[PDB]
């Protein structure tokens, strides 16, 4: 009815301990979602153009041109880590768990409130918020995944991370195909390169509408909604990082001269001269056996062009990389291609009392040492004469194509049948939890955005929209915008997300890295005197595991 | 900022200045988020010699 609630708030996290070291983690989230009525009931096809910015020669990387269908619906997206876990729960998970399985997800909407704003014509303006006991909220669940998948975490548009702060949904839109060509240039390039928006290819047009593709429930103030329980099939994630690179794989060389005194400079010596040694190498014409030349079972990580932009039907896009940079842990200023950089606002981690439009940003320096250090790379001739002469070695200090600032590493690629790499580690709080596998015939090995990728399917996107509340003067043959009573809605969204984890075992003598509250970061996990709150980022793969 | 009249010359605009925007990028040393630099799940197609 009207005065009877249709659900209960719940934001607790439960750890149910099972047999054989497994833990059933139940993350409950509950939010108060506020939704204004849409700008216009009509779907729009909007072409966004930034031809002004790109026209400046050498600025092609800043292309934003595209075409998108903008819809009257709003998306309720909970695909982010911060929605489910507070820093303490994440601390427990990372410090104690070794692997994380995604099990199930269900969500529901209850306690729907619809209100109308009546503004008086009094000389001093005033407005009063009445209820509307008959207005409806349209809720559509795309259980069949008939609509384009649009994860909001990539735009920091998921629900809030604070249970006590109301959150808003995101207006839904999806890309409409377009043809666009942009020939790159540089500062000082003469003339105007070909920079053109070509329209649309009819063979690719796709105009989706929620009304035609999904059943839409109408929820009055006394109604409820529940999506039911979906079950994932994603592969297990590891909360452990690998440190062994190719140089640390296998049996080290026996030391014939061990050190005899403590001290940093009292090194040990192998003894056998490098050309008189034993072992196996992939160098069929060289007698030298060294740690750099000795055969290894396979290659850890791979090299790829960094900051490479490739163009296609829709224009240029950065080539993604599956691993971070090398040595970034020693110097953050060297954090570069491959280390995801998250920007977010006051709903998703930034201090809630901050003023201004500037967002809060952080670069994630993954622990795993699967990355590369392109400055230490080099190529040398097949003859392998040592020391290598100038003409027989290509170095990162060598110009390629006549450019002083570009070297061979910028275009080098070593992905091969021997390559081995790890999945992207979870990013708290702003990291995405799951993502949809592509419908291509050959599917990518991993996604750079989510640790869980969806083999068959995973939960349909949930859409909400304030049903139109017409005035008596409605005339559908009028070309003007529909006349609607100012109406908004507030409804409680509750979700339950179920993981399964294994509790880690101490394999080694020494202790391992752990997350701990300390004097330097103490105040990031408590409110300020004026209620300000922030959710700083936390690393997720502290414990090390042996690669080989 | 949505368009207000029909015709090609009436585009839409994202509004937020590019270096003040929000999102996830694989470019750890720049604040610019554009449709060319924003993170995507994976790569469709590939270049070959």
């Amino acid at each position: 009815g009207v005065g009877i609630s249709t659900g209960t708030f719940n934001n607790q996290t439960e750890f149910k301990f099972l047999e054989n070291g497994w833990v059933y983690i139940t993350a409950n989230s509950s939010r108060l979602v506020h939704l204004n009525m849409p700008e216009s009931e009509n779907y729009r096809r909007v072409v966004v153009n930034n031809l002004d910015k790109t026209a400046v020669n050498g600025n092609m990387a800043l292309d934003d041109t595209h075409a998108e269908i903008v819809t009257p619906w709003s998306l309720v997206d909970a695909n982010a880590w911060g929605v489910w876990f507070n820093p303490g729960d994440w601390q427990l998970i990372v410090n104690t768990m070794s692997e994380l399985h995604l099990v199930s997800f269900e969500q529901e909407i209850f306690n729907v409130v619809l209100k109308t704003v009546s503004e008086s014509a009094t000389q001093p303006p005033t407005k009063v918020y009445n209820n509307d006991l008959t207005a409806s909220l349209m809720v559509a669940l795309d259980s069949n995944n008939t609509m384009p998948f649009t994860p909001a975490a990539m735009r920091s548009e998921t629900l809030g991370f604070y249970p006590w702060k109301p959150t808003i949904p995101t207006p839904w839109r999806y890309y409409f195909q377009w043809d666009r060509t942009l020939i790159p240039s540089h500062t000082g390039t003469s003339g105007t390169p070909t920079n053109i928006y070509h329209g649309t290819d009819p063979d690719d047009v796709q105009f989706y509408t929620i009304e035609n593709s999904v059943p839409v429930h109408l929820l009055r103030t006394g109604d409820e909604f529940a999506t039911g329980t979906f079950f994932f099939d994603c592969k297990p994630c590891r909360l452990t990082h690998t440190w062994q690179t190719n140089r640390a794989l296998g049996l080290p060389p026996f030391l014939n001269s061990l050190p005899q005194s403590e001290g940093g400079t009292n090194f040990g010596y192998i003894g056998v001269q490098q050309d008189k040694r034993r072992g196996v190498t992939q160098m069929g014409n060289t007698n030298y056996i060294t740690e750099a030349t000795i055969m290894r079972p396979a290659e850890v990580g791979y090299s790829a062009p960094y900051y490479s932009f490739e163009a296609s039907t829709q224009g240029p896009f950065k080539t993604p990389i599956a691993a971070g940079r090398g040595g970034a842990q020693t110097d953050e200023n060297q954090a570069a291609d491959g280390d995801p950089r998250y920007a977010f606002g006051r709903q998703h981690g930034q201090k809630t009392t901050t003023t201004g439009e500037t967002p809060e940003r952080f670069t994630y320096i993954a622990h795993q040492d699967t990355g590369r250090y392109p400055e230490g790379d080099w190529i040398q001739n097949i003859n392998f004469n040592l020391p290598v002469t100038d003409d027989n070695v290509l170095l990162p200090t060598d110009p390629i194509g006549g450019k002083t600032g570009i070297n061979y590493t910028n275009i080098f690629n070593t992905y091969g049948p021997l390559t081995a790499l790890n999945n992207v580690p979870p990013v708290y709080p702003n990291g995405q939890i799951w993502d949809k596998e592509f419908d291509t015939d050959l599917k990518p090995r991993l996604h750079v955005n989510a640790p869980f990728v969806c083999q068959n399917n995973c939960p349909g996107q949930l859409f909400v929209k304030v049903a139109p509340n017409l005035t008596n003067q409605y005339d559908p043959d009028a070309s003007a915008n529909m006349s609607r009573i100012v109406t908004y809605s507030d409804f409680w969204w509750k979700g339950k997300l179920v993981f399964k984890a294994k509790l880690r075992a101490s394999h080694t003598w020494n202790p391992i890295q752990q997350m701990s509250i300390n004097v330097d970061n103490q105040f990031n996990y408590v409110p300020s005197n004026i209620g300000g709150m922030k959710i700083v980022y936390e690393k997720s793969q502290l414990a090390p595991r042996k690669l080989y | 900022s949505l368009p207000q009249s029909e015709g090609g010359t009436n585009f839409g605009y994202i509004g937020v200045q590019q270096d003040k925007r929000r999102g996830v990028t694989q470019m750890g040393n720049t604040n610019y988020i554009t449709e060319a630099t924003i993170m995507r799940p994976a790569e469709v197609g590939y270049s070959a010699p």
Partner: antibody, heavy 132, light 99 residues
Framework: EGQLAESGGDLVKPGGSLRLSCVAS????????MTWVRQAPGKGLQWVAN????????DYVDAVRGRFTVSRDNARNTMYLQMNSLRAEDTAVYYC?????????????????????????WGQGTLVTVSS | VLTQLPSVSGSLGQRVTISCIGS?????????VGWYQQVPGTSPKTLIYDRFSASRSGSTATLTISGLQAEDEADYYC???????????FGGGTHLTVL
């Protein structure tokens, strides 16, 4: 629709400095390439300078190179022209205008391409003179 | 500086052409061309971004005006972008006398 509005033009002593302003109305200023042009009385239209939307690059004519400095403020939604080292030749009416960055191919504009050399909208203008 | 005619004249209701005869790497090259109208004391108005028409016409652009009236008895300017200067350039302007 919104329009531009110039201000700051006036007689000033030769060799001095001044600062012309061009207020912009409408949401397109942040997105538009801005330009300054000047017209000496009964003379031909003379380009002064241009600056892109993001203040990434600036261009001037040799006649004002090293003397004029164009700048913009999206927070104030305005453009400015610092006319340092004023010279007798600066006496003219100065306008601020918008350079058309996109030109549509089809007459209904289903396809667009970048270009330069056409000014879309013009401001009111301000008169500047250089004399003692 | 682009070469533009000093002036042209014609009676009411007739058709006239005002030509811009700049060189290559300039208005007479793949770059765009723009025409503006102005009466002394008024800001120029951009004609071609309805009775008017225009054509780059290879190395020499032309604006075909028609329906000459008391209004439009004004000055007309040609503009383009020059690569040798890498900047916007203008023609000398042309005046129209309507008889």
């Amino acid at each position: 629709e919104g329009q531009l509005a110039e201000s700051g033009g006036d007689l000033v002593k030769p060799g001095g400095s001044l600062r012309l302003s061009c207020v912009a109305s409408g949401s397109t200023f942040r997105n538009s390439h801005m330009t300054w042009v000047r017209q000496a009385p009964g003379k031909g239209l003379q380009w002064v300078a241009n600056i892109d939307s993001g203040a990434f690059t600036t261009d001037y004519v040799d006649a004002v190179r090293g003397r004029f400095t164009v700048s913009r403020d999206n927070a104030r939604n305005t453009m400015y022209l610092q006319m340092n080292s004023l010279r007798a030749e600066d006496t003219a009416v100065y306008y601020c205008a918008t350079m058309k960055t996109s030109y549509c191919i089809d007459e209904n504009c289903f396809s667009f391409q970048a270009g330069r050399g056409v000014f879309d909208k013009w401001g009111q203008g301000t008169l500047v003179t250089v004399s003692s | 500086v682009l070469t533009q005619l000093p002036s042209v004249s014609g009676s009411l209701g007739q058709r006239v052409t005002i030509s811009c005869i700049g060189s290559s790497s300039n208005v007479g090259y793949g770059n765009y061309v723009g025409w503006y109208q102005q009466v002394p004391g008024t800001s120029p108005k951009t004609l071609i971004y309805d009775r008017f028409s225009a054509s780059r016409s290879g190395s020499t652009a032309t604006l075909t005006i028609s329906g000459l009236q008391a209004e439009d008895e004004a000055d007309y300017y040609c503009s383009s972008y020059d690569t040798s200067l890498s900047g916007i350039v203008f023609g000398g302007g042309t005046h129209l006398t309507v008889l």
